[PDB]
Amino acid sequence: GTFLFTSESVGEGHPDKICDQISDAVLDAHLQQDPDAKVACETVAKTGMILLAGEITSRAAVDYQKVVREAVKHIGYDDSSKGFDYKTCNVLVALEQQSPDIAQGVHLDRNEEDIGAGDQGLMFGYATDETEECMPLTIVLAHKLNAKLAELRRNGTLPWLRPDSKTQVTVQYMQDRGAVLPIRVHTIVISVQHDEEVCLDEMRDALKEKVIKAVVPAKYLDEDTIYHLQPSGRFVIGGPQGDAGLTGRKIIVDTYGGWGAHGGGAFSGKDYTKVDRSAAYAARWVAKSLVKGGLCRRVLVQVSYAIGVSHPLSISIFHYGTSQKSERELLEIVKKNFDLRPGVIVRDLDLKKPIYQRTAAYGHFGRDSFPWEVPKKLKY
Amino acid sequence: GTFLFTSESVGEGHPDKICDQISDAVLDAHLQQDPDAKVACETVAKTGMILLAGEITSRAAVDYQKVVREAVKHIGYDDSSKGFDYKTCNVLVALEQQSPDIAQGVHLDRNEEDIGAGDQGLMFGYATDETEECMPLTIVLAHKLNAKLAELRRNGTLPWLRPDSKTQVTVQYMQDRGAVLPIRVHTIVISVQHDEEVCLDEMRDALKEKVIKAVVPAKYLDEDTIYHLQPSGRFVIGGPQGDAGLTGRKIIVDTYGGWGAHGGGAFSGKDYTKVDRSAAYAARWVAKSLVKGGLCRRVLVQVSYAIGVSHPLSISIFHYGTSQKSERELLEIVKKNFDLRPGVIVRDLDLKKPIYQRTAAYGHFGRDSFPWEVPKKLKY
Ligand SMILES: CSC[C@H]1O[C@@H](n2cnc3c(N)ncnc32)[C@H](O)[C@@H]1O
Ligand SMILES: CSC[C@H]1O[C@@H](n2cnc3c(N)ncnc32)[C@H](O)[C@@H]1O
Ligand SMILES: [K+]
Ligand SMILES: [K+]
Ligand SMILES: [Mg+2]
Ligand SMILES: [Mg+2]
Ligand SMILES: [Mg+2]
Ligand SMILES: [Mg+2]
Ligand code: NA
Ligand code: NA
Ligand code: NA
Ligand code: NA
Ligand code: NA
Ligand code: NA
Ligand code: NA
Ligand code: NA
Ligand code: NA
Ligand code: NA
Ligand code: NA
Ligand code: NA
């Protein structure tokens, strides 16, 4: 009756995540000055280069050089010995205004509540009662392993660590009437960039004793757990020098780690009129509200939009058999309690606030009591 | 007992899809000369620009200018009046060799069958008996609508069409013992770039009569079907000029349209040692083999890897209740019939052949009897 499930996470210095963080630093910089900025900022990172490309229409005056370099500094790439340095990297900017054809179809001369979706697309929300934060254990543990690496890098106790890391956690689960119950950790992978001097045995010992044991409860680890620690054997070249990064290439790390579903839309670098972000956050809010409200133990929500149209085209609820109410009944409860127009979501979730860089590593969900993590009390 | 589900697709000239096609044109060009080329080619597209960035180690001599421009020509961007022209665009190249640290951990001095996975990650395969090609109807119809647009553009019958398009199809389904049965089309969205002269009523009439009716069986369309045709009202600016494109930003369009699950890894621009592609293709092959073999009606397969390790770390089978056999029994059948090491998958699926550009629009699955679409006869 048991099964395995695997999820991964990446660290703040993983090149794709660098791009997500930069794109959201750019968004935040615009929103600090112009809450109605229209932002669609993609970032590319390769050896020695950050390129910004996309579309921004805003009243803000933003120093892209400074914003980009400060984000890279925070991540920890501050010297050529680490493969990348915020002080001496190339920052190239290929930003244009938002297409006027998009603007006229989406938001020009529209009442805010009746703004159209900024694009077509589909989005999902998911929640599971297997953890208090209503997230899958696999992805929670994978994120926490990367956060622990960053902590031990920044506090100087593992000074050989560099910012680029990846983790992967496989958990053995039991099924319980559509809900899932974690039993044990089956396999853990950790790969992290390191300095030229530290040897493999020192790193593997530290990753087990100072990282895994500081994160994963001992009850989940046993003599059969498989550890793949620095499995490549050498990871000195890293960051953008080891692998090109792009915004929106970690969309499963950003969400549910393979659980539930994904509609394909990236989050970072986008203002609220891009329903890829706002409606995914709202769908998480719905799903978590259903689970915390006791209506389900596990639930997947789909919503979809057409460009220029305010109301969603479709809403669907899938409860995995974990409710006494039918999926139709839950859908009616959702429709009576939520208004998923983007110009309403923006108000309910406060999506003009410049908090987005904080979302761009360690997952957008399950953390810090962001507005989409605070369940709505449902009337039914 | 019914529910809605929505999927989308994009056309060959959608800027993200342009990037996928270019990245796979680059891969194919290398593989034509060096079947063992190591390729990780990301493409970015914005107004007037194609940038190649990533890592290639290969014995091939490739003219990137020519390869890129020929791909853009095939797509149809051949004049400034369309927003982009293969003849006069900027092609910038930021390609380096594969990291030697990766190479040593993955494939150097390794027997081909025992090559390590080129990265960690998780991948899913999915199959559903609702169509003969074992794909969801929503995504099949969405792809076919984009293909029809391209056909009518290329044959000159709708000469106002341009290459950038998006479609979205919402289908109303019934559940049947874990399987799904399409009933009717609930909503269709089509947005397509167009010339400055054609009016909105002409376009909307043509999209209904020459596109939708030529693609979607009349039995699925009724007086209640909702049509959002050119919903933005104006789409003259398009392609990279309207929206930046990046490789690997259409991973749900490339796969199952929201159905099943996704592990996050993009396909295009990657050789077979990148399990993001090879193992996803193998997982599709497994899933389709289970459905065509009569063991399931619907199935999701998860596999996962660690960099440098040949065998998958985990394999999981989820059959939605559509088999008399337990998921454990199906997993044993899979393990007895499939060897999911990348250096074996490459042989079974012929993944050194330069056919990848053909996969990079209209979905990687459900078409053209590629090797992963030909079911394996299972022994059990
Ligand atoms: C294998 S390249 C994809 C990702 O894997 C990581 N990576 C890069 N080099 C190595 C390496 N030598 N060993 C393990 N992981 C690596 C980096 O996070 C990179 O973005
Ligand atoms: C809204 S920008 C995201 C995508 O939507 C498409 N698009 C661009 N401009 C428009 C427009 N004016 N109307 C409808 N869709 C558009 C293009 O495929 C683009 O890549
Ligand atoms: K990459
Ligand atoms: K974009
Ligand atoms: Mg990547
Ligand atoms: Mg999208
Ligand atoms: Mg895109
Ligand atoms: Mg990956
Ligand atoms: Na810091
Ligand atoms: Na809970
Ligand atoms: Na336990
Ligand atoms: Na060093
Ligand atoms: Na997921
Ligand atoms: Na909290
Ligand atoms: Na052609
Ligand atoms: Na079938
Ligand atoms: Na019918
Ligand atoms: Na024109
Ligand atoms: Na999908
Ligand atoms: Na065929």
What is the per-residue DSSP string for A72-95?
HHHHT-EEGGGTEETTT-EEEEEE
Q: How was this structure determined?
A: X-ray
Which position has the token pair 């089309």? Answer: B185
Which structure tokens are listed for B33? 């000369």
Contacts of A337 (CB under 8 A, 6+ apart): A289, A376, A378, A379, A380
Beta strand ranges found along chain A (DSSP E)? 2-10, 38-46, 49-57, 78-79, 84-85, 90-96, 121-128, 161-176, 179-194, 226-229, 245-246, 298-305, 314-318
Distance from residue A185's CA to the centre of ligand 9 (Å): 30
Distance CA B94, CA A256 (A): 33
- Residue tagged active-site, from A42, A254, A271, A373: A42
Cβ count near A329 (within 10 Å): 15
For residue B234, say whether it is annotated as part of any ligand binding site. yes
Nearest-10 crossing angle of helices A275-292, A342-349:
60
- Cβ neighbours of A260 in B, within 8 Å: 261
Work out the widest C-alpha separation in chain B, in whole angstroms: 64
Q: Resolution, rounded to a tenth of an Å?
A: 1.2
The CA-atom distances, in angstroms, between B160 and each of B78, B195, B199 are: 14, 5, 10
Question: How far off is chain B from A17, nearest CA to CA, in Å?
Answer: 13
Question: How far off is chain A from B240, nearest CA to CA, in Å?
Answer: 9
Distance CA B271, CA B276 (A): 10
Contacts of B4 (CB under 8 A, 6+ apart): A302, A314, A315, A316, B170, B171, B172, B173, B186
Which position has the token pair 């629009």? Answer: B361
Domains and CATH numbers, chain A: 2-10+137-237 (3.30.300.10)
**Contact assignment for A3 to B166 by CB distance below 8 Å:** no
Distance CA A284, CA A281 (A): 5
Which structure tokens are listed for A261? 């579903």
Distance CA A190, CA B145 (A): 43
* Residue among B21, B62, B23 nearest B43 (CA): B23
Q: Which ligand is nearest to the CA of A182?
A: 11
A259, A136 in Cβ contact below 8 A? yes
* Residue among B36, B124, B44 nearest B89 (CA): B44
Question: How far off is chain B from A261, nearest CA to CA, in Å?
Answer: 5
Which structure tokens are listed for A21? 């963080």
Distance CA B317, CA A331 (A): 29
Distance CA A10, CA A150 (A): 11
* Residue among A175, A107, A132 nearest A341 (CA): A107
Q: Would residue A222 show up in a list of annotated catalytic residues for this protein?
A: no
The CA-atom distances, in angstroms, between A104 and each of A41, B62, B191, B233 are: 20, 43, 15, 8
CA B183, B189, B195, B201 dihedral sign is: positive
**Residue A151: φ, ψ to 5°:** -60, -45
Host H or E run for residue B54: strand B49-57
Contacts of A206 (CB under 8 A, 6+ apart): A158
Distance CA B273, CA A366 (A): 33
| Residue of B313, B329, B332, B334 to mutate when probing chain A, most A C-beta within 10 A | B313
Question: Does residue B273 line the site of ligand 2, with CB under 6 A?
Answer: no
Question: DSSP per residue over A105-117, as a string?
Answer: HHTTT--GGGPPB
Q: Would residue A16 show up in a list of annotated catalytic residues for this protein?
A: yes
**Contact assignment for B242 to A47 by CB distance below 8 Å:** no
Distance CA B332, CA B354 (A): 33
Distance CA B3, CA A169 (A): 33
**Contact assignment for B306 to A246 by CB distance below 8 Å:** no
Q: What type of residue is A110?
A: R
Annotated binding-site ranges of A for Mg(2+): 16
Question: Does residue A119 line the site of ligand 2, with CB under 6 A?
Answer: yes
Distance CA A264, CA A251 (A): 8
Task: Tell me, rounded to whole angstroms, the distance of Cα A316 from its chain centroid.
Answer: 23
Give me the residues paired with residue A79 across strands: A84
Query: B297-323 burial, b for 16+ CB within 10 Å, e for fewer?
Result: bbbbbbbbbbbbbbebbbbbbbbbebb
Give me the residues paired with residue B184 across strands: B172
Distance CA A309, CA A315 (A): 15
- Cβ neighbours of A49 in B, within 8 Å: 53, 94
What's the angle, vertex CA B160, arms to CA B157 and CA B162, rounded to 5? 105
Q: Would residue A208 show up in a list of annotated catalytic residues for this protein?
A: no
Distance CA A144, CA A167 (A): 9
Residue B307 is classified by DSSP as B
3-state secondary structure of B177: coil
Query: A163-200 burial, b for 16+ CB within 10 Å, e for fewer?
Result: bbbbbbbbbbbeeeeebbebeebbbbbbbbbbeeeeee
Question: How far off is chain B from A2, nearest CA to CA, in Å?
Answer: 8
Host H or E run for residue B41: strand B38-46
- Residue tagged active-site, from A5, A8, A12, A16: A16
Distance CA B233, CA B215 (A): 23
Closest-approach residue (CA) in chain A for B123: A258
In total, the C-beta contacts within 8 angstroms joining chain A to chain B are: 255
**Contact assignment for B258 to A253 by CB distance below 8 Å:** no
Distance CA B351, CA B345 (A): 8
Give me the residues paired with residue A57 across strands: A38
Give me the residues paired with residue B84 across strands: B79
Q: Sort strands A179-194 and A226-229 into parallel, antiparallel or unpaired.
A: parallel
Residue B22 is classified by DSSP as H
Question: DSSP per residue over B192-233, as a string?
Answer: EEE-SSS-HHHHHHHIIIIIIHHHS-GGG--TT-EEEESTTS
Distance from residue A54's CA to the centre of ligand 7 (Å): 10
**Contact assignment for A120 to B252 by CB distance below 8 Å:** no
Question: Does residue A232 line the site of ligand 1, with CB under 6 A?
Answer: yes
Q: Would residue A332 show up in a list of annotated catalytic residues for this protein?
A: no
Residue with CA nearest ligand 2 atom 7: B238
